[PDB]
Design a protein around this nucleic acid. Structure first.
Lengths: 86, 74, 92, 105, 100, 95, 86, 90
DNA sequence: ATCAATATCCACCTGCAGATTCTACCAAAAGTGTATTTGGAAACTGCTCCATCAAAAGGCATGTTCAGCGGAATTCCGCTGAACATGCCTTTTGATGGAGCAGTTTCCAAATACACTTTTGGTAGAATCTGCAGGTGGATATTGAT
DNA sequence: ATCAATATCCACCTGCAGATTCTACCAAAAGTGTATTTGGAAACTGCTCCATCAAAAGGCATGTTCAGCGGAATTCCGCTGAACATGCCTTTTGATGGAGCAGTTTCCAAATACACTTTTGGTAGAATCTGCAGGTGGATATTGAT
């Protein structure tokens, strides 16, 4: 998946196995941090379900200004599109 | 946040002599500190759909800023 | 003398636990900053207090590090560059 | 079939993310949107870092991204530097930077 | 029945109700409650002494702070923790004292 | 109308009384102790959780609590806390 | 059977190599006492990480310290490491 | 002149600066003093080295700032000590 | 060394904000017992990869000489903090409507749990592909001596 | 400032380790389709406790005066490090025995899953109690002037 995204942004660029290993550590790290925040967020609100809403708040709490804004838009857009598919 | 209050803080910190410019420097730091914490506190507030910032919202914000605070719930 | 009276102040204030900024001014500041994130907010009394406790505890501790940077420099006045150094090393 | 992760328009695998959510014990329940949103965000962040790392590779006349390119892209970007402020990228080195006062003359 | 003052039933319930794992063995909450009780006794013991030394019978925040920051280990455990109304330890940098 | 609110206060009291029978504790101080018990609980449970996850285990047993404790507690808070925990599990099984 | 005694291996940090690390850190001039101070700092740093890494090893009932063990130990103490498995 | 030449040289390359073999004992040595009979995956030793060197480099940056603060260009042990005290290592 | 102005202490006193004590109601627990299920320890073992010995050679550590020059020690003095007493503008304290924070009820969109069907991302492995490490040489600075 | 000594920059060149590309197997996924269960948004509402206001309280703004900090200029000692000669020990390419990690199947101690009963910790209103915070007095240590 990292390779697919790479080709979209730099069609004519590869990536060494070590760099790929670093990218894999990065995705897992961000996943855990976002999920952790969502987890506590749910518990603080006595909610047993993690929805796109907790994930969104978790993203606002975790990411720096500009990255949050764009992450949120991509997340919102993907859920809206996903929800519109019959 | 007045000169005498900043000076009192410095004293509890064991500071003996204070430069004139310290006082605007402190205000700037305090502001950055509050901004960061409140931003998170307010984010927990909105998430819970309240219009009132609770002690817990502040406590949770302090905690994940790595500034855990005891005495206000949790 | 100059700095003497300082010394007794350190003795005094250290060994009180009371707050050191005044409440109303601090409250106005907290509300002003919050208004920029979301309008027409209310604050539990305990919320502003938690904020004031953490803020003062933060600043006191920073003044300790600032002092170490000043004296490291063979000074007794703290200056702004002392605070900056401490924050940079802190990673803030 | 279509797979979800076309349903959402999303290179990253919605199915796997939904599963990893479940198996990580983050809540009793996990809504259907949660994994779509999270996968989108993950894909967005890797696109951001790869855009920047790819550029660094380009400036160093290289076609293949290596750890140093990832490090250069991260430390030169304020926000990514902040998000990864407590992270160490193996074999990334550091940014070139000499304090003013240390230069001669 | 585990010979503790702390609530094993509550701890078990909390351990489950916290999404820490799929299952929670029977011994876990017992072990955990005992650890919490021990640490609690440890701080109160020291805080209590801190109060006696000030000729007071009631432990207040100040006494919890003095007890914690004067104990290397508790101080380590609670390095990123702030205790409200605790104040700081009396301490002035040598180089700042009078010339004498 | 209920809306009621569990807390470690009673059993902090109790404990206080074995260690110092003649000493009291103010409300604000009890609130600090409550935060203290909840904080240690979440820190220990969190590390035990990670431990079980790491080793692909579905269960958090007293073994995880022990390792969590050795990871979290300094040298000699660990030593004692470990013995206290072993002692309670022993006096629990044997019963 | 086997076994040589390992001792004074701290002296291995070859007080160039200490110089080289300081260069990467942007240091221009180094006092003669820096070498021993640095060895002491490196010792404490390694003791804390290996202590936790080995604790994870024993908990899993292994005799071999894994890269995961170290990676987990490093994260414990907020020195997250990318690229050695994830 | 040589110092600056070296800073530029190292600040750019990425290879480990401590000899591999030597580093790798006083991993074993320290580890041994904690628990005997331990084996190490070679990548576990490499992870420790990558982490130790990143930690030392970042520590010297901070040390460098402390010396400069004192209007010096030689780092001394007290700079390293000030940096660690502020970092709350200390 | 001798006061003179204060700051600091300590022993005693007591009003009251906050802590302790007794009663009564009860949803929420926590304990208990039965029935069903299953995680993960144990025993067997495939097979990865860790420890280790070997041998060769040059990258790089070590140890010495000797000079460049940083930084502590010292004297000098400009000017900035800080002490202090003057005057009141702001914060603090206690009384009061009303906005929401919550407690409770309803009920449907959405999340399990279950049985199959099908698309896919690992991977073990033989084979071709290719970016760039690394040695080479020469144009271009960057320094140091004068 | 022109020269000489050197380090750095940099495009060209090619053996080769690491990487992009399959043909083939597939267990673990992920997707499709009822059936059953329920978390939590939504509407309504009572009691908090939060924002607001006026009167009583006490901390801060302000200008003069000057102690004394700490940067500037000067000095010289002795440490740091560039240059260099020597040779050790790390690094590298290999190969091997076997420890011990990890895959697979077996099977019971222990955990989950209701269902029923007993106890209990938390909440609310009332009454009563008390540790100690400020307040006073008088002693005496501390600091600054002479």
């Amino acid at each position: 998946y990292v390779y697919k995204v790479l080709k979209q942004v730099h069609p004519d660029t590869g990536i060494s196995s070590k760099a790929m290993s670093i990218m894999n550590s990065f995705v897992n790290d961000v996943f855990e941090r976002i999920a952790g925040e969502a987890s506590r967020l749910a518990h603080y609100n006595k909610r047993s379900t993690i929805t796109s809403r907790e994930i969104q708040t978790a993203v606002r709490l975790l990411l720096p200004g500009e990255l949050a804004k764009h992450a949120v838009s991509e997340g919102t857009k993907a859920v809206t599109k996903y929800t519109s598919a019959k | 946040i007045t000169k005498p209050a900043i000076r009192r803080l410095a004293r509890r910190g064991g500071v003996k002599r204070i430069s004139g410019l310290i006082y605007e420097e402190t205000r700037g730091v305090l502001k950055v500190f509050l901004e960061n914490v409140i931003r998170d506190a307010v984010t927990y507030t909105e998430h819970a759909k309240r219009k009132t910032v609770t002690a817990m919202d502040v406590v949770y914000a302090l905690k994940r800023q790595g500034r855990t605070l005891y005495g206000f719930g949790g | 003398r100059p700095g003497t009276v300082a010394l007794r102040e350190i003795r005094r204030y250290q060994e009180s636990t009371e707050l050191l900024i005044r409440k109303l001014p601090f409250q106005r500041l907290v509300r002003e900053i919050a208004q920029d994130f979301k309008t027409d907010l209310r604050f539990q009394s305990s919320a502003v207090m938690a904020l004031q406790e953490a803020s003062e505890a933060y600043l006191v501790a920073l003044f300790e590090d600032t002092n170490l940077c000043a004296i490291h420099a063979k000074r007794v006045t703290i200056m702004p560059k002392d605070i900056q150094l401490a924050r940079r090393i802190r990673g803030e | 079939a279509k797979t979800r992760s076309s349903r959402a328009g999303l290179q990253f695998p919605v199915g796997r993310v939904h599963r990893l959510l479940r198996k990580g014990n983050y809540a009793e329940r996990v809504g259907a949107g949660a994994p779509v949103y999270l996968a989108a965000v993950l894909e967005y962040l890797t696109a951001e870092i790869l855009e920047l790392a790819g550029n660094a590779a380009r400036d160093n006349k290289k076609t293949r991204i290596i750890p140093r390119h990832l490090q250069l892209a991260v430390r030169n970007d304020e926000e990514l530097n902040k998000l990864l402020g407590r992270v160490t990228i193996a074999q990334g080195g550091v940014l070139p930077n000499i304090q003013s006062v240390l230069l001669p003359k």
